[PDB]
Amino acid sequence: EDQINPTRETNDDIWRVAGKFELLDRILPKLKATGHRVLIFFQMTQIMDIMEDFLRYINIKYLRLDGHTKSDERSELLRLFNAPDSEYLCFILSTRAG
Amino acid sequence: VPLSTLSNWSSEFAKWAPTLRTISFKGSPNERKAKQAKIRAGEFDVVLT
Amino acid sequence: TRKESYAIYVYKVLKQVHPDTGISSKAMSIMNSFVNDVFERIAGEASRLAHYNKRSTITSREIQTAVRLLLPGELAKHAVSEGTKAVTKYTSA
Amino acid sequence: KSRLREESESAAVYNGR
Amino acid sequence: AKAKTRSSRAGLQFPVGRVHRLLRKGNYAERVGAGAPVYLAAVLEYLTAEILELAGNAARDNKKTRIIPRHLQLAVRNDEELNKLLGRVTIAQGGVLPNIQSVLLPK
Amino acid sequence: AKAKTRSSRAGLQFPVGRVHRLLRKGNYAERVGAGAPVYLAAVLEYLTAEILELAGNAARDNKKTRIIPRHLQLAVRNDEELNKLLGRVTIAQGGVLPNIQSVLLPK
Amino acid sequence: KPHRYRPGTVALREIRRYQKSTELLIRKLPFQRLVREIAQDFKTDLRFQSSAVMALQEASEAYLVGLFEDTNLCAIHAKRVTIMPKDIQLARRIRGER
Amino acid sequence: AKRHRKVLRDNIQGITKPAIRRLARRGGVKRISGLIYEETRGVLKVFLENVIRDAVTYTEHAKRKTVTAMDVVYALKRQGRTLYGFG
DNA sequence: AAACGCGGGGGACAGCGCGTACGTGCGTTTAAGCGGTGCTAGAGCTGTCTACGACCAATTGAGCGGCCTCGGCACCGGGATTCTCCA
DNA sequence: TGGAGAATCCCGGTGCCGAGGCCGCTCAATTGGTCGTAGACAGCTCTAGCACCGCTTAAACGCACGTACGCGCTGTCCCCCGCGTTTT
């Protein structure tokens, strides 16, 4: 990450260096077009973080969840899905805890 | 039940059935002292742990 | 797979000496290490003496010399006597 | 642009620990 | 013939033919004078008694019938000649003797 | 049959066959691979070259074309890895190196 | 009556109880990661005995404790109860390390 | 921060200043200077390395990949830190 | 040399100052460590195998002890130099 | 900042015993054949180190601060050595 970009800022080469990531920018206008919500699973502590960059890069709102957090925010984020008026379509979910 | 789905079972223990009391176990140990010394004698219908 | 150790022997000297005190296997392991430790210390010192005077029969005289040399104070003179003691029990037997 | 060298040969050195 | 162990001849627990076997094994001399293993197993049992003594002492001083390496530390390091002879031997889970520097004590 | 030493075979001066005779006669192991004498006598020759350099160096620095033990002191102890290697090895009549304590000397 | 002490006071019971007890005083995952880090630095990829980890730790923290006594010996010898690093380095010097 | 974690310190510094305080209290320090927590750490790692390099040297001469507490016995005895309860 | 003194002046020492530091308390997390997985790796156990220097026979010149110097360096005479203590 | 003097370094003349080589004369060091055996090395297995995260939570860390002690500064007195002594 440092040898590619030492500035580690929001860059266009975040989603153009990988193969899932270029196609993910192909669907993100279309996911915003289709209006159907998408649940995506990731590995812990690293793949979600760079996905937090990319969904913020195309400016699609998103939630998150993990294992070393507290349980207070767990049930509240369940309640935020049950409201249908969510402007966020995609969000981030875990396999081992979630 | 698992820690991921605790309150949803308890919310369904509220809406789908009344008169069944529920005892939870979560978080820091300070809040448990109020419950598990009050219901130390075990006046409940369900412990949801 | 019966492999000769000193755990029941340190147990033997334990219940010979402190039968009121059982052992942890950690202290047992410390002593089982220590047994072969000084078993190598004094006998390497004894082979050092067996090369000091170029000898090939290390007897209890030579272990007496090693006990004389290495051990401080009573630790010599007791192991002088005790190291002779069962020697006098085995040279009899 | 396109999908796509200096980052590879540096990775050829840096990841060789 | 049978393993009729040579410690019983010496009144010992440490089989003196295992000791004679070890002395023939350890390259100490060509002939192992057969009292050298008895000298060895005899000094061995003397020191086994020496240390099992103070070990049970310190263990029951800590009101435990199980001799632990902490008890081994507090019995061995209290000795002049032992810890003088074993200044460089460390006991895992032996720890420290309880003692503070004098001027660091508050007044 | 033909008495011919291994020092020319390895490019050394120290008798590597004396090393092998002492190696079999040192009982370090039963099979004594004769390359282990050469690995010994090689480091012997190499470190004798390492030290005679320094010894004659300190000698000629003391205007001497014979190594005296004072020159051995100035050879070994001024080397940091020799003194680190020989922290408890001493040269008789090597003497002492000139060094006054700092606040002892005037400033 | 509150018990705010001045800089100096609370330490000594620990100086009792540590020496009254028999254990190590270190976070073990930063210690076992230290073992794996340092042992990797000589030659990477070891399978790692945690027995080796504690077998190093026992000789470690004992030697650590052992140095601080001569440190305060140089400190109180130089009439100080606040220890200094010069006490440590002189202690390692007369100990032969420095 | 939340975008990329970057939350590591070290393993020598992973030993905490309260852990250095703990050992300093077991070692007899009343008022630790701030420089002690790192001058301690330096000589701690200095002590650490010399054992395990020769322990790996054992491991290679013994043709292994698992550096053992047996190697810690093999080294610490030879490096003058002979320990009872590990061999 | 030792050995016995002996001014002698500043070095130890006391001691006072001063100010800050370093713990201390306590607020704030937080990574510690625990479980808990999932697995697999080299450890471990066997499985034969041969080569390897053992060992000893023969030999032989190595190399070093006893036998030949003469010369590197010490000793000393004399002087140049160079540090130190009172102007 | 400077000369007087006491210590040092250096340089010229002497000579010597030790450093080094000389002269046999082995004896040890080698070569020459084993010699099974030691470890050489194939297979097997299984385990035991392996990260990893769920999560806690108390430990570490975050900071207010309070003063203690460590040094800032002094005078001393003392005390130990220097100059002179001789004897031992």
Side-chain angles (χ1 to χ4, degrees), chain A residues 24-80:
Chain A
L24 224 54
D25 202 4
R26 297 287 292 203
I27 73 180
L28 247 54
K30 293 201 300 300
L31 289 189
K32 203 64 179 62
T34 45
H36 294 256
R37 317 177 63 178
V38 178
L39 345 162
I40 325 118
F41 297 94
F42 311 90
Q43 207 55 252
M44 278 276 292
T45 319
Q46 234 77 26
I47 280 90
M48 314 181 178
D49 280 60
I50 315 174
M51 194 61 62
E52 282 167 0
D53 313 337
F54 168 71
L55 300 182
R56 197 186 184 87
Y57 187 72
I58 324 289
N59 287 273
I60 280 88
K61 224 162 66 72
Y62 57 93
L63 331 162
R64 60 186 303 271
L65 208 140
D66 53 326
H68 81 96
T69 188
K70 240 60 191 61
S71 181
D72 309 324
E73 49 271 21
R74 183 186 311 264
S75 294
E76 183 181 5
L77 260 306
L78 306 186
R79 190 177 61 185
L80 292 188

Side-chain angles (χ1 to χ4, degrees), chain C residues 13-55:
Chain C
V13 198
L14 180 55
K15 315 306 162 188
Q16 269 179 325
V17 166
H18 262 272
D20 42 324
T21 349
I23 210 174
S24 56
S25 43
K26 228 298 229 146
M28 170 64 71
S29 64
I30 285 186
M31 299 335 280
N32 254 266
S33 65
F34 180 79
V35 160
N36 306 275
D37 146 62
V38 211
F39 144 78
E40 279 305 310
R41 290 187 229 178
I42 306 183
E45 162 72 35
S47 191
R48 157 228 251 83
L49 297 154
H51 209 71
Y52 275 179
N53 356 287
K54 316 246 83 62
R55 268 298 178 93

Side-chain angles (χ1 to χ4, degrees), chain G residues 52-69:
Chain G
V53 174
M54 323 324 274
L56 290 166
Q57 202 154 17
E58 292 267 1
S60 311
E61 309 203 24
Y63 126 88
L64 290 174
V65 161
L67 189 48
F68 311 141
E69 311 131 6

Side-chain angles (χ1 to χ4, degrees), chain E residues 64-81:
Chain E
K64 306 300 141 184
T65 195
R66 272 113 202 209
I67 296 166
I68 79 190
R70 159 74 180 192
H71 308 151
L72 298 192
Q73 187 93 22
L74 303 205
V76 162
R77 304 306 161 197
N78 279 325
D79 186 278
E80 173 265 340
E81 227 140 30

Side-chain angles (χ1 to χ4, degrees), chain E residues 68-70 74 90-101 103-106, chain G residues 9 12-13 15-16 18-24 58-59 62 69 72-73 76 81:
Chain E
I68 79 190
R70 159 74 180 192
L74 303 205
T90 323
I91 291 174
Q93 255 311 298
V96 216
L97 280 153
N99 33 49
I100 309 188
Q101 304 266 263
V103 333
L104 303 195
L105 298 163
Chain G
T9 308
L12 277 109
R13 288 154 284 186
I15 315 180
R16 266 148 224 127
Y18 296 154
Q19 295 158 158
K20 196 179 184 183
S21 58
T22 158
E23 69 271 325
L24 309 155
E58 292 267 1
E69 311 131 6
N72 231 321
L73 276 159
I76 306 152
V81 302

Side-chain angles (χ1 to χ4, degrees), chain F residues 9-24 26-31:
Chain F
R9 292 171 174 262
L12 321 172
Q13 304 306 290
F14 298 106
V16 205
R18 177 182 309 172
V19 181
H20 192 27
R21 185 214 70 199
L22 281 163
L23 257 263
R24 291 173 265 97
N27 327 290
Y28 320 114
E30 167 257 330
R31 299 252 205 203

